[PDB]
Design a protein around this nucleic acid. Sequence first.
RNA 1: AGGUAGAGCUACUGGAUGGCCGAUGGGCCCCACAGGGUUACUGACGUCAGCCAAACUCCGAAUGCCGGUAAGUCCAAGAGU
RNA 2: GGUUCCCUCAACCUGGACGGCAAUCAGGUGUUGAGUGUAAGUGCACAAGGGAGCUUGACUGCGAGACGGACAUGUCGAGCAG
RNA 3: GUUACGGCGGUCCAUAGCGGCAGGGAAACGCCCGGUCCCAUCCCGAACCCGGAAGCUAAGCCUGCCAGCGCCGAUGAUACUACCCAUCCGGGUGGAAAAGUAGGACACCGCCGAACAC
Lengths: 136, 49, 79, 59, 126, 192
Amino acid sequence: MLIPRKVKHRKQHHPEQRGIASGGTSVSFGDYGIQALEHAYITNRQIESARIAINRHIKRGGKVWINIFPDRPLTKKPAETRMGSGKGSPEWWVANVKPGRVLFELSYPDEKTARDALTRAIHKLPIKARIVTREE
Amino acid sequence: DVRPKITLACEVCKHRNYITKKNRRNDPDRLEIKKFCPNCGTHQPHKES
Amino acid sequence: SSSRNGRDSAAQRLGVKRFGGQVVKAGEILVRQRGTHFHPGVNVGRGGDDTLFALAPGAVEFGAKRGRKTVNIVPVARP
Amino acid sequence: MKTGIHPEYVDTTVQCGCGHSFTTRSTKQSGTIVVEVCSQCHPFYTGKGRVARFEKRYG
Amino acid sequence: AHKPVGQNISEVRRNARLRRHARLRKKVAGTAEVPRLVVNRSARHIHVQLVNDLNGTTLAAASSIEADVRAIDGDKKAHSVRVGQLIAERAKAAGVETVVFDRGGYTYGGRIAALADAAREAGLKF
Amino acid sequence: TANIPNKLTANVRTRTGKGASRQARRDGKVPAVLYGHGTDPQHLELNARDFAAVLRSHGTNAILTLDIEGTEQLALTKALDVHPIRRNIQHADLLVVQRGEKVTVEVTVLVEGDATPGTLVTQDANTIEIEAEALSIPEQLTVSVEGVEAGTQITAGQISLPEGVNLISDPELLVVNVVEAPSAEALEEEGA
RNA sequence: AGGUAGAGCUACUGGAUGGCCGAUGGGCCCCACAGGGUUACUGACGUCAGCCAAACUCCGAAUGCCGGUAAGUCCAAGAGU
RNA sequence: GGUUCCCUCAACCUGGACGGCAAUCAGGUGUUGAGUGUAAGUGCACAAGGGAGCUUGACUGCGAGACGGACAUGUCGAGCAG
RNA sequence: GUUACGGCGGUCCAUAGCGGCAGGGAAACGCCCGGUCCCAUCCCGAACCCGGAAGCUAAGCCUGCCAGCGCCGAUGAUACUACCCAUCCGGGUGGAAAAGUAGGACACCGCCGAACAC
Ligand SMILES: [Zn+2]
C-alpha cells in the first residue's frame, strides 16, 4: 500500500471538495486512462485493490501507471468515547480527487482487453469514471 | 544567586545612586564604573557596595 | 488521553494606523510592526521596536526606493 | 614591516665544498654558513665516510 | 589565445571604494543650506564638488587640472592645499556658509585631510 | 506539402465579456482572436460545428481562410481552450500568416509497425517541434518499429522529415522507447 | 496597506509518479594487494514530462476597512457626538 | 551594551605531509540557500552577520504628539538643558 | 557647440542584468615604479598611506553589434468573486486573475568638469 515516508504535519484539516481539476486531466504516459467524474477521497486501499484488478486481467504484458498518491491523512478517535479531549490519531491516507482528474493509465497491445481491464478497476472505486484515450 | 542585585555608590559623597545586576562568578570583584552623580553634579567613579 | 496544546498569547494589534493621504501631526505613530517591512522615508523615524512615527506634520505617502517599501510625509501647504 | 616582532635578519654568505659561493640574506646570526651539497653539486640537477671505507679496507 | 582567470586589482579597488562610499552616504546628504563636499582622489590629481542632493545639482567645483594649481612647485600635498583654498573662495562667493564633508570613501588623512584643513581656515566651517 | 486553405466565415463581435461569450456558445459559436503581425487583435465568432469539422480531418494546426465581413485573411490555428469534462472548444487563438513565412509548430508522431513479439513499445514524447512554411506544415509524422530488438531509444533526431521542414527541439528527445515486455512478477512490484 | 479565493513551483520548505545518463555498493572474474569489465542487480547528483500542501509562496483578485471629495435623504433618518 | 573604521558568507570544483566527505593553505564559481545568545514569526548582504581601537548613555531634570484600551495595566516618541 | 571623455545623482531600480564578438588612450580614469617621510599588517608597502612617471591599453572603464540565459508582457478566454434570480442543477449584471501566446528589450534622464571649436 502507498504510504508517504514522512509528513511535516500529521494531523490536518479535511481536503476541500469544490471545483474541477486544474492539472492532470490528460493522458500522458500510457494509451488508455480512467478519468474521474465525481469528488471523493480515494483511500490507499482502493488503489491497491484497483491496480491488482488490472494486473490479473492483462496477465503478463503491459505497464500500469498510478497518477495519484495518498498523501493527506484522516484521523479517527478511539471508539466509544464522548466528544472532546483532543483530536484523533491518523488512521488512513486518502487522495483528493476532483472531476476531470485522470487516475490510472495502461499500455497494452490490443484494445478489447485494455478496456475490459480498466472496467474491472472502476468497480472498486467509490465514484463514477470513464475510459479515455490519448487521441482527440 | 549567580546574578544578584548590586548598588553602586559614589566614591566622593558615598551616595547610592544606581542599582544593577552582575554575574558574581564571571566578575568576583566589586564592580568599578564611572556614572553621573547628581549630588556632585559631575561624572564620578562609582563602586559596588 | 488529553491534549498537550492549548496555549497562545495576546494579540498585539499591529498594522498600519495611518493610510495614504491622511494628515498627521508630528510624533504621531504611523505603522506598528515587528521587522522593517516598511522602511522610514523623509520626515519619518524608526522607533525602538521598529515603529514608524512622523517627524513633521504633513500627509502620509507610501513609496518605493530600490525595492524597499517606504513611508514618506509630504508638507501640505498653508492656505 | 613591524619593528620589534620579527626575527633578527642578517646578510649571509653560502659556501659549498665545490667552491660555489652565494651572497643571500637569512636568519643565521653568524652571517655565513657552509653547505655540503648545492645546486651544482647534486647529481639530480646535473644528471650525473661509510662508502669511503668500502674503498679503504677492500679497495 | 589568452583569457584572464580572476579579477584585476583595479577592478577590486574600484568596487570596494564605491562599496564603502555608499555606506558613508547613508548618513551625510546635501541640502541647499548645507551642501555636501564630495572629494575624488586619484594617483595624480584630486577633485572636489559642492552638491545639492535635493536637485542633484553641483553648486561649486575646484580641481587640480587647472593651470594655476599645476604651477605649484610642491608635492601632491601642496596641490591639495591650493585646491582646498579655491573651494572656500567659490563656495562663499555662491553664498554658502556651512557644508558637510563627504570624504568620498577614502581614509581621512594625508591628501584628503590636508584639503579639508586648508578649506577650514579659509572660511568654510564643517 | 501544399495544403488548400479551409474557408470559414467569421463575424466581428459586438459585445465581449463572460456574459456575452456564454450566450455565444449557447448559439453554436466559438469566440476567437486574430492577432499576429497585424498588431491589432480582432474579436471574431466562428461556427461551432464547422470549426470542429475542420479540426477533425485536417489536424489541430489547420491553416484557415477567414471571411471577416468581406475581407479574406490567411490564419493559422495557434491554441485551443477545451473543457476537461464536456470536451468543448471554449476559445481559439488565431495567428495571421502569409505565404513564404516560417512558423514554429508542434506536430504529432505516430508509431506504426509490429516489433519483436517479446517487447513492449512505450512512447515518451507525444509531439515534437518543427519549423516549416506557413502552408507546408505536415499533418502528422510517422515512425516505424518493424523488427526493432530489445532496448532501443528512437530519438527525435532520427524522425524522417519532409523537405523544407527543420527540427527545432533538441535531437536528444526520447520519442519512442522499446523495452522487454514485463512479466507477471514484474507487474506485481510496480506501484506496491 | 494587505495575502485570503484562485493559481504556481529549475521561485523557497516538505510530499511525490514515470523515463534517460550514471558516482556510490552486493559482488564475479582483474591469480593475493593496486589493477577493467561483468550482472532480471542497489542506485546519489543531474536532466525530460505529468502532480500536491491550514502552519509552502516568484504571484494574486472580488468584497471589506481607513481618508478626501461632490451630491442625495433633509416640515426626517426621528441620524451622529 | 555605546561609538568610529574595515570585511563578506554557506555550498561546490581543482591542487596540496601525515589528513580521510569534513581540521589549516591556495585558485575559481558562488546575491544569499550561512549566521543572527535562546522557540516561532517579521526582518537583516545597504548589512541588524564577521573583526579591531577607545569607552560606560545599562545617565540626571523633562517631555510636544500618538498606539492600545471596561478599569487598573502596557508601548513608541522628536526635542530642550546639565 | 562637439566628443568612443571623467565625476555626482535619479527611475514604482534588471525593458537597465549575465554571456558572446569587434574596437579607444588628446586631457582625464587605470594598471605601473619605489618605501626616505605622515600612515599600516592579528605575519605580509598584497590592502590603507605617501613620493613619482620608464611601460601599456593586456585587464578595470568606455563604444558598436548579437535575443543563447535571465527580465518585462498585452488583447481575448478561463478560474474566482460582490449583489440578485433559482424548490435539491444552474444562471444574469459588475469586477477580474495565475499560467500560456503575440511581442518588448543589450536602458533612459539631470547637474558639473575636461580637450577641441567659437
Ligand atoms: Zn557623588
